[PDB]
Amino acid sequence: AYTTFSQTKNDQLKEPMFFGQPVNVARYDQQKYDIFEKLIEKQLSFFWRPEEVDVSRDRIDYQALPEHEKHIFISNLKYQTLLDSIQGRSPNVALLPLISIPELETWVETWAFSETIHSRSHTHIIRNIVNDPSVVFDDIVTNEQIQKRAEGISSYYDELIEMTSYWHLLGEGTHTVNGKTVTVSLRELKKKLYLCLMSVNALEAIRFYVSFACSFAFAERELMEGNAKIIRLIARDEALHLTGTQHMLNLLRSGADDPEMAEIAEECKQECYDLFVQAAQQEKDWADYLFRDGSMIGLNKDILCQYVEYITNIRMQAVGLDLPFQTRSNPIPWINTWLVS
Amino acid sequence: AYTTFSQTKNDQLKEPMFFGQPVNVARYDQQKYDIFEKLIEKQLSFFWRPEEVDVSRDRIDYQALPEHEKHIFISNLKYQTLLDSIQGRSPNVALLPLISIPELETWVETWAFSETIHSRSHTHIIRNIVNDPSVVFDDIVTNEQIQKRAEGISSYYDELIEMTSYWHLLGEGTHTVNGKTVTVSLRELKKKLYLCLMSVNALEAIRFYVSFACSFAFAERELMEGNAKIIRLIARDEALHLTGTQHMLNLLRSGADDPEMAEIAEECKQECYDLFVQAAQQEKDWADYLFRDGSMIGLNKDILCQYVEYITNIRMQAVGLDLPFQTRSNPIPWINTWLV
Ligand SMILES: [Hg+2]
Ligand SMILES: [Hg+2]
Ligand SMILES: [Hg+2]
Ligand SMILES: [Hg+2]
Ligand SMILES: [Hg+2]
Ligand SMILES: [Hg+2]
Ligand SMILES: [Hg+2]
Ligand SMILES: [Hg+2]
Ligand SMILES: [Hg+2]
Ligand SMILES: [Hg+2]
Ligand SMILES: [Hg+2]
Ligand SMILES: [Hg+2]
Ligand SMILES: [Hg+2]
């Protein structure tokens, strides 16, 4: 039931963002939602190559860092590397099969592409600061504290993908497979998509943002400046990515795109609220682990805890959720220097 | 059983290209096959923005073409628009879920991205040479002769995706699904992927080169120069794309990757041959439609037929297949100018 070229002539301006007729012709002269075309144009305008950033002094900077600061630096970078590894592939494997307007289709492929550039940039840094990159790369997979902080990201995508496959193969209904009942409901699949996109919003809008504070705290001391330049370019992309998910989510909950989806979103208001708080809690928990045997000029576990609360309130507000934390001004206004957006 | 972040610490240098553990960490410091890393670098080096291309003279040129030349030009562009629509999405939906080495995964995503840029360039031209783009785009979907020429492309991808979903959901074996016996064979799925790759090779290496020749026949008349600029950029990318599939296919044939894929390539040899012979015939058949209202000096059914045979023999040789066609020299050596 999925096809790479639906042979039915359809009005692409009238399809929903998701679950409609798969996109046939790729055209960009018109859109149902011009935000997605504007994001494509902007991301293309921002194209960069990691190899064109001078990183030659980052190795000696890193080596001269006190052992606990090396630990803060490398652990933060390993988590960034985990997140971009996942985001390189997942928007394509998880969202593309479900998209039914051309502007959003191409936005997702362009988004995913920009993520692979991010992963390439993380290799560029690692190669240039450690003798054996394999040690860093292997620790990403098995590192207990990172299985923990991002515990649950791959599962949301994975369940969405599995349910999408059942939907595409069998359609809605009550089915049997090898002696067991398998229920496929479009409503449940819409719910999974909604929560997946909420989680992707928290990933890019908060999890990655909190990581920028660690990277740019070294930059403020004129250390790891090659890395800083790369993270700066990544943050400029991230601003677009979270703008895309913000719009998808707001168009889904308003009811202008799919009334069923607006019901679903109201229905999981509490669940979503609680998912946001958990992501924030996970990032707080990591902060402590980062800072377990020392702190830095400009950063420590309580400052980065406050930043997690600050950023979380802003993002939740932006997608129409209640604020879990005490309202405060930015605890690290110096970071605005680096977040050019 | 697909996962976006596989949990086992595996040696990515020892996975197969396809069907191994899904890639976890995306790293570019090492490769099983450096050709794919070299292709990513080159394609990134070629980044272009379609809208920056000046096509302001193409509307003048186009509107002044005789009607039969408008037909030739726009039928060709509509077919290019079809193939890049499919290619923008298909490598990511059909291949990406089966890749087990990071360099191949990222190449497939870069390749696909580059195809969405091709599609964006077709919009750029179309919107600047006609007053209603929708008539052009709508016709791509319903045009009986366009779809006849493309028959089998989306069908092949679609079949591979369905079979892949069954494999990820149920695993190998014989299953009972809504009372029907469904066999999931990894060997059969490997054959499907393998022949999909062969078909993609024919698509980029033959079907698109035939279309380039029709595009450049106008450039040779000093017409449609914005478009020719765009097609030259497209062709530069296409050369990388076909290099990628040639190397995937030839590495599989070698036995140096998955040994079962090497058995499959040999076993399915005739199927490989047949699919190239059918694609070539479809490209020939398109001539009657293309030249329906008349042909052009140096571009007609005979010339097109000759070029199809010429290029098909070259691509077939490059992946170890016998040649179906009589050997010939290039019937349109003027195209070399445009193909750098
Ligand atoms: Hg998602
Ligand atoms: Hg998700
Ligand atoms: Hg941090
Ligand atoms: Hg819900
Ligand atoms: Hg919700
Ligand atoms: Hg909600
Ligand atoms: Hg949420
Ligand atoms: Hg906190
Ligand atoms: Hg706090
Ligand atoms: Hg294919
Ligand atoms: Hg031609
Ligand atoms: Hg073959
Ligand atoms: Hg011929």
Oligomer: homodimer
Q: Which two chains share the most extensive interface?
A: A-B, 67 and 69 residues
What is the CATH architecture annotation of chain A? Orthogonal Bundle
Structural class of chain A: mainly alpha
Helical stretch tally of chain A: 12
Kindly report the spatial arrangement of strands forming the biggest sheet of chain A: 1-2
Main pleated-sheet profile of chain A: 2 strands, antiparallel
**Approximate shape of chain A:** globular
CATH topology of chain A: Ribonucleotide Reductase, subunit A
Order of SSEs of chain A, N→C?
HHHHHHHEEHHHHH
Extended strand count of chain A: 2
Could you explain how this protein is built, in words?
Chain B: Keywords: Deoxyribonucleotide synthesis, Iron, Metal-binding, Oxidoreductase. Chain B: Pfam families: Ribonuc_red_sm (PF00268). Chain B: One of its GO terms (biological process) is deoxyribonucleotide biosynthetic process. Chain B: It comes from Escherichia coli (strain K12). Two copies of one chain form a homodimer. Chain A is an all-alpha fold and 341 residues long. The first copy, chain A, has a single domain (1-341), classed as Ribonucleotide Reductase, subunit A (Orthogonal Bundle), CATH 1.10.620. Chain A contains twelve helices and two strands; from the N terminus they run αααααααββααααα. The first copy, chain A, has helices at 34-45, 58-64, 67-95, 102-127, 133-142, 144-149, 153-170, 186-219, 225-254, 259-267, 269-290, 301-318, and strands at 173-177, 180-184. The first copy, chain A, has a two-stranded antiparallel sheet. The longest helix of chain A is centred in the middle third of the chain and has 34 residues, at 186-219. The radius of gyration of chain A is 21 Å and the shape is globular. Chains A and B meet through α3, α4, α5, α7 and β1 of A and α3, α4, α5, α7 and β1 of B. The complex binds mercury (II) ion (HG) (13 copies).
